[PDB]
């Protein structure tokens, strides 16, 4: 009950107590999260929208 | 790579032109029929060695001796710098 408290606490709050973050692993948690591996550069984001990988197959 | 010869060149503008005109590209936009995929394309376009000659002709000859042109090729070669040290 006091840990469900104190999380409705620092409900959405950025820099929560150590105790409530993911406990996975040391690696992972250091490891780059999603919006971070996404990120591409301007020059990159405009040759994957210029030339995409097509679905091309060798019937005719 | 770069292209030093006219029938290799030619002959990958002709594999180009097959590959390019048996495939088959959906369109980006979906609604993408039945793909029915091959898993090898070379095995559609497999190399074929180009002909060196054909089975028979017809015999000409002028009796030059190719051994005797082979022999003097070699001994040529032997001498070309010693010969233009000796013309001047």
Same mark, same amino acid.
């Given at each position: 009950?006091?840990?469900?408290?104190?999380?409705?606490?620092?409900?959405?709050?950025?820099?929560?107590?150590?105790?409530?973050?993911?406990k996975?692993?040391?690696?992972?948690?250091?490891?780059?999260?999603?919006?971070?591996?996404?990120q591409?550069?301007?020059?990159?984001?405009?040759?994957?929208?210029?030339?995409?990988?097509?679905?091309?197959?060798?019937?005719? | 790579?770069?292209?030093?010869?006219?029938e290799?060149?030619? !002959?990958?503008?002709?594999?180009?032109?097959?590959?390019?005109?048996?495939?088959?590209?959906? =369109?980006?936009?979906?609604?993408? =029929?039945?793909?029915?995929?091959?898993?090898?394309?070379?095995?559609?376009? =497999?190399?074929?060695? =180009?002909?060196?000659?054909?089975?028979?002709? !017809?015999?000409?000859?002028?009796?030059?001796? !190719?051994?005797?042109?082979?022999?003097? !090729?070699?001994?040529?070669?032997?001498?070309?710098?010693?010969?233009?040290?000796?013309?001047?």
């Open positions: 009950q006091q840990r469900e408290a104190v999380r409705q606490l620092y409900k959405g709050k950025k820099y929560q107590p150590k105790d409530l973050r993911a996975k692993t040391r690696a992972l948690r250091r490891a780059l999260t999603k919006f971070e591996a996404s591409v550069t301007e020059k990159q984001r405009k040759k994957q929208i210029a030339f995409p990988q097509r679905k091309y197959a060798i019937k005719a | 790579r770069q292209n030093r010869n006219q290799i060149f030619d !002959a990958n503008v002709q594999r180009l032109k097959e590959y390019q005109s048996k495939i088959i590209v959906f =369109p980006r936009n979906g609604k993408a =029929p039945e793909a029915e995929q091959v898993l090898s394309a070379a095995a559609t376009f =497999p190399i074929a060695q =180009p002909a060196t000659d054909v089975e028979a002709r !017809a015999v000409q000859d002028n009796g030059e001796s !190719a051994f005797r042109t082979l022999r003097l !090729a070699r001994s040529e070669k032997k001498f070309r710098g010693i010969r233009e040290k000796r013309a001047r």
